[PDB]
Point group: D2
Chain length 466, copies 4
């Protein structure tokens, strides 16, 4: 192994290893990079930032418990704050496809925070003095209860700060369009066939209701994620931690994040299984199922400009051609529906990985959180992009909407109570056979005048019960 | 088409069709059987029974609204009660793989209830008099808002009466075993490797906590399922139903079932999408992920009798061989883990089908409810079978548990505070090299007497924090 | 346990058990029914029939090897032939969710064939004389190498006799429509937007090519399925079978079926894993992905009759209403697309189950073959139904096809070489702005006469390279 | 929008846009980055390199057809060679979650190759002179037939050069271990229970056979991938390309790659669907199912060091602790099994995306190739890492293997032919009851001497047929 850049010597129990001088990680992170260079997927930075939160909270807890000297605590807190702010993300090189407990990324956090703290103290990086990655930064913690804590911190923060606001904000654009479109009457479509009318606002209200329900399902995940594994140590018993550490470290994490993190009531389930994250992903899967449908309705309704449906007009954002006026490819719908297919696959992966726990520890932890955060960021980013570059600009093509409404055969049942089923069916059959409107067929057959037809067939009286 | 058995003539708008005389379905059910003979999967009987509930509630509602005469209402209610009790299930022959709105099974219910009601009145089956399948049994309803109502009734009743009790009951067997095993100390296993100890009760407490969380996730689905589509009619607007029908029919369904069914606040989402059923299935998927792990722990811990782990003993229920004493194949674990694999696949199918709605109607309704009820019955039945024939009979193999506890190298860290890390590591290395116990190595090296070892290494002091 | 019907006493190593007198199964099948009453799914009858084939072949082999007397062989062959013909399927009551090796269904076959053979000999059912279910019907076989042999026999026969012919036959209907439609020019659609033209025959040729490729992928599975596990006995070594049994029994199975069954070259992989069946299901998944798209194109192109696309007309098979002329719901497309969603979920289940083998035996065998045969029958049946009741009757709506072709803006690039890009773009922009055709805009602007437009814009010259 | 770095002005039909001066992409790539900033996933570099191959081949073809001047061809070829060698990968910033046709990445290739070619000619970047991204680099190509060509080139090259060699090489390490272990007799395990013996070589032969079959399934994909969409242009007809372009460009791609690329016989299926890539992913899924099982056998057999199975010893690669001798966590098995879970989820995503084609174009192309290449690289990299750091170092723990072999009860059936079933069963029952070996029980009961037992029970005579 070699590095073009200058290196320093670090040590672990396997001996010396050279580490790039401008990086803060240590011997074990460097050594592990050599053995787990699988794929391109770097551990998600939300997990790195959550490790910063955990290590800060641990230092404050160990200080309060009298275990960690104030001067060492202050240095660790300062470095862990930089980690949690994302300022040291280039020092976290490990891939997802690592130790299944995530211990390697826990040690990456310990080594980075130790070496940055050593630098803040004016010491020699790699010397483990005055801040030792295991003895100080990992004090009262274990190889097994740290990564699952980072998983739940990362997922809960991302739900609250990124995903739920993105879905709420898209819902309120659809609601604003719903209100704008509340008096536009359009033809229904069931089984893809022409059907009785509804307003464009009513149809958009379905999307609003779908998104409302998804918001609620995502919120219902959060209490499970607020429960933290920290304090279970190696197998769940808390052996070799302080009797107060589990509760106090969660108290500090709650204070740091202003979210109601608590210690997990059952540490054995918290280490041996990850159904809270299966549930988090399942709620995201329900959102992908709703978004697939909503995005598909928008692109089908806007299809054209002349040989599709064409009831809606969407904004064009990629360059067009002056020789192709009216043509708009629905590229935000395409990105969103591709995201939705990915989320349904990621949901399969998460459930498979969760099902594979053995005894005291599920060792599929990195792939579980990787898929949760991948789906979350894809969904949130696509909601935001689809909102800005498609949904906010949706407009009705009123002449097309109106054409379908008054040229469909489906309004004919408004005639039954006036002329009877037989005469109404005759009007519809003649309209269909002669390729004319219901009104034109009624006049042609001498059954109704045009004024009688307009009195009897009022679409605004066909969008609610009697 | 032909029937060995005597037939009667029925009619629909395509003409005459012969229907077996001893069956209550009518022309459209018979005719559809000829076009949708796909697979072997008959529509689940819970859906049939829910149609009975809906049609009874509809008749009572239409009677109260003055639309349906009392004599016709009474006959429909009587026949619909037989349907809801399962007494007419042989008259529902249609397969899952039918019209994607489920309208064919709605018409199966209308025809059966009409012909049975005609028989109760002493009339001629097939005559549609005095009870017409469309004009009376389907009064105020539509082809599109009836099957989704049956879906939610069936799923909510099955959750409440079958699945949730089965999971609760399995949880309490594991809790009773947890209590029985609370003082049995065993070796932990992490990454499949020997680890620090925990009690067998603590390990079973993890399973108890997993099942508790699953119960809660399944309960959280129910409010979505209690909302019913009935009253949305063809496209969600309620055109061609009574303005009070949606609310009153749900009131009657709630009274019949003693569950809090209500009309859906948004009929457009209720017809165009089925995320409540995606969510119902997702919660079942979390249960499958937990059960896979629990069942696998039980069969691995009981593996043997001599060359596996062997900490547990499970009951034998299939015949054994007197020449193979001690051997027990974990067949309830095998059936359960196969069920869990099926549920994870069914969850993929449900999300795909839900994602495929278009405009005013999702027309994947039968496959969605088919998978929900299939997974539900597999999970509930396997919980019950695994409980009765495996979990209730789990016993510890105390000599094997004890052997591992005192022959593992992992208890050596109890020595550090007395003799130091170096001497403790020397004891462990000698034990490993010489294939002897930690106590034997400590004595062999002259570092500890046996009495000193027993004083310093107390597994009962190694299962909690300091 | 009890039975309304008369019973006889049977015995196994757990004692006496009552078995219905009119059923041919024995003690172990009855006893197992009491422990594995999970779900409704009875082991697929193709597996039962394949057990008949295996047991006939085994009897002929054991006769040839001198192990089985001729009189006993003849009786077993006669009963096993009845099993393989489906004549005894009501005597196979066990569910899929059984012993994960499938040994319970192997014993169901042994007991049925033994008791039917005893009856043919005039003996006492349940006495195991003169035909013993284990000592004669299971002679030279094991509990573990029999069900996987039945799996491969069932799957290979079903591929050859049912699935592949169904797909080939649907392909040739689409090819016949392709030929009929080869001169009908229609507008292309890309991203759902209007695009340059192609013939309806060219578009159908895509479906033909998709089905051809699927046929090839399904055929490529077969050599893996022809390799049989029989002869591996308990763990793959062949301990306790005749050195010639594995090869000779496969020779007899090949002769019975007229398919090239052979003994598996590696019995350890044949018992410990089932990737041939994962591959069989994966090829079916590719067919589901193609059929979803083909069925969706057909229903979208036929959507209407007036407010959708409407380029195609499909046959109506469920009763319509004289007041709704022209309306045809695409119910065969709906059943097919629901089947396709199911197959994608079943594919997830099969891969999960296959991944879960341990050591010498994968004990997820029933769920693997259950999903393979479920997907196979759904796909084959839906192909046949969709062919008969939809594809064979597809017709073009030529006036609608022609309207789109000549009212799209996309043909304008045919003008560039005659009038230049600028004038062509001006024609398109005016057509779009004024809601008129390209020809009308060209005339309106004085750029072209109508005769010049017709000379320059020839759709029949726009469906191939220069 | 802004850039800290110096920028140049580029133009598209939407106007001016600033592009970083040190980047080779152009207006449309920059503008699209602003609209499709979804997730972190950059289009896989294999697709970028394949675009280099396509654009080189296109330039050579257009030169041969007389359409492209030699001086412009030479410049494009030079720049496209740099792209195909990976030398310009920092100039391809677009994400997977883009236009569903992949046209945006096609234009990224055109703009990079144009601007690099302009630089090679000494011109002004952004001027589109002397090399125009559309008029020259995209000459004879379309927005829709280019990305699918890159998909197939990338996948076929990656199969041949990376995935298949990685699987073959892992197979031959397992085969070398198989040969080394051919005389080591161990206890079988079925259903996780002790079973009759087999050699460790026989058990490893199962893994070898599984990998051989997977190699064959992966090879069988390749003929589908060698067929290329290039030449189908917008909808499959080849409108607006040269009649010889499709065949000649594939000829040039075959010459460049030394792989047998050919033009696709049906361009409509090639644009409208992607079952070749579903099949490619399905074959990778079969490999994930095999690897999950193989990796699990290795980690279970090596579990310990004292309270698991412990028949194998694996190398330790992460630092251990001198106080935990003998303990080795199976971290390569963990990374591999996590990869396998990911591949099963990715397979679900690929099938869903492929099923969603409409009319002339499937617009899920980026997510399909993203998952194919993600799964491929994870599988190939994990095979290589698992080979180097686990499989090559697998050793038997012969004392543990031997202990199980001679202390299992399963060898007792070797006694039946000498002492009868009854006496053999008595020996087994006494051994089990008294916790002693079969030999000790036989002696204790006075049934056999130790020498008689050793003569009658020879494990080397128990691993094959009579």
């Amino acid at each position: 192994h070699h590095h073009m850049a200058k290196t320093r010597v670090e040590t672990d129990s396997m001996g010396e290893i050279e580490v790039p001088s401008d990086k803060y990680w240590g011997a074990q992170t460097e050594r592990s990079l050599h053995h787990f260079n699988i794929g391109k997927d770097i551990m998600p930075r939300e997990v790195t930032h959550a490790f910063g939160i955990l290590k800060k909270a641990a230092a404050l807890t160990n200080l309060e418990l009298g275990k960690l000297p104030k001067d060492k605590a202050d240095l660790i807190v300062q470095a862990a704050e930089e980690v949690s702010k994302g300022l040291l993300d280039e020092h976290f090189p490990l891939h997802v496809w690592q130790t299944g407990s995530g211990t390697q990324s826990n040690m990456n956090a310990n080594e980075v925070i130790s070496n940055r703290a050593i630098e803040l103290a004016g010491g020699t990086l790699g010397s483990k003095s005055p801040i030792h990655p295991n003895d100080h930064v990992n004090m009262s913690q274990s190889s097994n209860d740290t990564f699952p804590t980072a998983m739940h911190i990362a997922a809960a923060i991302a739900f609250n700060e990124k995903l739920l606001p993105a879905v709420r904000n898209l819902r309120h654009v659809f609601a604003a369009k719903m209100d704008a479109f509340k008096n536009i009457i359009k033809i229904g479509r069931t089984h893809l066939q022409d059907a009785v009318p509804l307003t464009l606002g009513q149809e958009f209200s379905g999307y609003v209701a779908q998104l409302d329900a998804c918001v609620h399902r995502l919120e219902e995940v959060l209490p499970e994620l607020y429960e933290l594994a920290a304090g279970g140590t190696a197998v769940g018993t808390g052996l070799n931690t302080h009797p107060q550490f589990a509760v106090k470290v969660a108290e500090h994490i709650a204070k740091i994040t202003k979210l109601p993190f608590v210690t997990a009531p059952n540490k054995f389930a918290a280490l041996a299984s990850h159904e809270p994250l299966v549930h988090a992903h399942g709620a995201m899967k329900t959102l992908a199922c709703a978004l697939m449908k909503i995005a598909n309705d928008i692109r089908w309704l806007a299809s054209g400009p002349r040989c599709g449906i064409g009831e809606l007009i969407i904004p064009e954002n990629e360059p067009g051609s002056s020789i192709m006026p009216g043509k708009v490819n629905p590229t935000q719908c395409e990105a969103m529906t591709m995201v939705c297919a990915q989320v349904l696959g990621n949901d399969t992966a998460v459930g498979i990985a969760d099902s594979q726990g053995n005894f005291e520890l599920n060792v599929f932890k990195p792939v579980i959180i990787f898929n949760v955060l991948h789906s979350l960021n894809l969904l949130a980013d696509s909601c935001h992009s689809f909102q800005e570059f498609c949904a906010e600009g949706i407009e009705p093509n009123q002449p097309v909407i109106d054409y379908y409404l008054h040229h469909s055969l489906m309004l004919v049942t408004a005639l039954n109570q006036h002329i009877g089923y037989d005469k109404a069916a005759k009007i519809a059959k003649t309209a269909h056979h002669d390729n004319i409107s219901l009104q034109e067929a009624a006049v042609k057959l001498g059954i109704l005048t045009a004024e009688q037809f307009a009195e009897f067939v009022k679409p605004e009286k066909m969008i609610s019960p009697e």
